[PDB]
């Protein structure tokens, strides 16, 4: 029925839970920056997290170098929006490559085509 | 040196469908939704995302209302709507669904129930 409008309302509410740290069940630090998020949302958007969390494994040493790129990727997962620029496109690509998110990988490849 | 602000209009739909797939397999579910005594697995965050009642229930891990709603009429349609936005309304069950959706503060279901009063 109203599935697109309801799913947007659900994602918006999941985003505000993340901003307030409510019902978050996983935490990362990358470059000294703390992140809070839902394991279920991560698994719904990244195959790396899906394979990691379904295996009942937790995060310790996330193998990424950029916290700014991780913030942009985590922002896309909760808002469906991604702002690419020549200053960040390579860091977003490295994070998305590790997270196996093919949608963001192709998006960065398109940005570098210019 | 071009900059692109990208928008993925189908991403929220894909996220919810993936969350519904996790539910059907019982993966990453951390709560139990009860209908007619039957246990249905779900995500605390998803239920809290659709209902303020469940936001207070799961953040405070306590029932500030003190009311058993497992035997509430119309509750069987609530869990399927939160994960699929599908609703099987009939003039036989709208009042029950409207009542429980008002209690759970689910404005999406409230409007759809008001739509059968438009007819």
Curated annotation (Swiss-Prot), chain B:
Residues 6-109 form the BTB domain. Expressed in germinal center B-cells. It is found in: Nucleus. Disulfide bonds: none annotated. Homooligomerizes (via the BTB/POZ domain), multimerization is required for DNA binding. Interacts (via the C-terminal zinc fingers) with GIF1; the interaction results in the recruitment of MYB to the CDKN1A/p21 and CDKN1B promoters and repression of transcription. Interacts with TRAF2, interfering with the binding of UBC13 to TRAF2, and inhibiting TRAF2 E3 ligase activity. Interacts with MYC (via the C-terminal helix-loop-helix motif); the interaction inhibits ZBTB17 transactivation and growth arrest activities and renders it insoluble in the nucleus. Belongs to the krueppel C2H2-type zinc-finger protein family. Transcription factor that can function as an activator or repressor depending on its binding partners, and by targeting negative regulators of cell cycle progression. Plays a critical role in early lymphocyte development, where it is essential to prevent apoptosis in lymphoid precursors, allowing them to survive in response to IL7 and undergo proper lineage commitment. Has been shown to bind to the promoters of adenovirus major late protein and cyclin D1 and activate transcription. Required for early embryonic development during gastrulation. This is Zinc finger and BTB domain-containing protein 17. It comes from Homo sapiens (Human). The gene is ZBTB17. The chain holds residues 1 to 114 of 803 of the full protein.
């Amino acid at each position: 029925m109203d599935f697109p409008q309801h799913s947007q309302h659900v994602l918006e509410q999941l985003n505000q839970q993340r901003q307030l740290g409510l019902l978050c069940d996983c935490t990362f630090v990358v470059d000294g920056v703390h992140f809070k998020a839902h394991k279920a949302v991560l698994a719904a958007c990244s195959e790396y997290f899906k394979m990691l969390f379904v295996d009942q494994k937790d995060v310790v040493h996330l193998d990424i170098s950029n916290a700014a790129g991780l913030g942009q990727v985590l922002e896309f997962m909760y808002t469906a929006k991604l702002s690419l620029s020549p200053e960040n496109v390579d860091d977003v690509l490295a994070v998305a490559t590790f997270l196996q998110m093919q949608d963001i990988i192709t998006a960065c490849h398109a940005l570098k085509s210019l």
